[PDB]
């Protein structure tokens, strides 16, 4: 029956698209981390302008709460409920850790070093102001993403049996 | 059924890249709301004006991620031209940001100039990047409709 398969595909694709939106929000924070202590140069490269990171981190913070918000609305019956919940828990822990470090992350003149302990994956100087939570959230959304992609693959495969 | 199987497969992948590019644009909208702001103990944003240079560098590096995602999107006939158009718009957006480095790449980037670069519908003007951002957003909307329409005609 082609109709049953047609709905299976559209529903699997819709869940994948919803998950990939959250993972792209996460990937944008990785892009923000590249800009810590940087300014745009005339030639398109980045140059140093150190320790003015507060509004960059403020942007990273509201993206992180947008991640939690979008994950809170995903409740289908497909079977990803436990992977979704694990990602939402990680997203809350990341936002709470940022907010909890406002004395270094929410002042005029936030330093490069403190910003990197918040959003730079694999930061060498430490991970105590958000990075550990960011890495876990990243892995949690990536697991979910691969899982929803494999569901879409198996639904599209049913077209030919 | 053969025709439809390809159209589903080709439209899904384009939809995938587009929705992830649109999420990157939503991240730039969050950056725009954070202009001149800092984090507070309760999660709200408080005012701390005119230090937007790394925020703008962050928007800029996102804009190059958008272009790279669009440049490797290698789609089917009937979507290829809308892909190429979106790629061109994303390039014009990054170019306009860098061309305005005299206001956007200095120590102490002002709230006013940051808003003319990344805040959609900024009241004082759109002359440092917003016009290109609005055009890129419209170009992605055209592409999204065309690819989602192929999936619909495919469910026939």
Swiss-Prot record, chain B:
It is found in: Cell outer membrane; Cell surface. The keyword Membrane applies. Keywords: Cell outer membrane, Lipoprotein, Membrane, Palmitate, Signal, Virulence. It is a lipid-anchor. Its main location: membrane. One of its GO terms (cellular component) is cell surface. The keyword Membrane applies. Major immunodominant protein in mammalian hosts. Required for initial stages of mammalian infection. Inhibits macrophage-mediated phagocytosis of the bacteria. Binds human plasminogen; this probably confers an extracellular protease activity on the bacteria that allows it to traverse tissue. Interaction with tick I.ricinus salivary protein Salp15 protects the bacteria from antibody-mediated killing in vitro and in vivo. Homodimer. Interacts with tick I.ricinus salivary protein Iric-1, Iric-2 and Iric-3. Binds human (host) plasminogen. Belongs to the OspC lipoprotein family. The causative agent of Lyme disease, the bacteria has an enzootic lifestyle. Larval ticks are infected with bacteria during feeding on infected hosts (mostly mammals) which retain the bacteria during subsequent developmental stages. It is transmitted to the next host when it is bitten by ticks. During tick feeding (which can last for several days), bacterial migrate from the tick midgut to the salivary gland where they are transmitted to the host. This is Outer surface protein C. It comes from Borreliella burgdorferi. The chain holds residues 42 to 197 of 211 of the full protein.
């Amino acid at each position: 029956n082609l109709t049953e398969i047609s709905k299976k595909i559209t529903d699997s694709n819709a869940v994948l698209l919803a998950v990939k939106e959250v993972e792209a929000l996460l990937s944008s924070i990785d892009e923000l981390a590249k800009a810590i202590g940087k300014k745009i140069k005339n030639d398109g490269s980045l140059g140093d302008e150190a320790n003015h990171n507060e509004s960059l981190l403020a942007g990273a913070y509201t993206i992180s709460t947008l991640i939690t918000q979008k994950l809170s609305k995903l409740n289908g019956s497909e079977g990803l409920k436990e992977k979704i919940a694990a990602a939402k828990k990680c997203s809350e822990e990341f936002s709470t850790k940022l907010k909890d470090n406002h004395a270094q992350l929410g002042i005029q003149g936030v330093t490069d070093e403190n910003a990197k302990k918040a959003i730079l994956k694999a930061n060498a100087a430490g991970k105590d102001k958000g990075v550990e939570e960011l890495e876990k959230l990243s892995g949690s959304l990536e697991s979910l993403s691969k899982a929803a992609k494999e569901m879409l693959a198996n639904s599209v495969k049913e077209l030919t049996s």
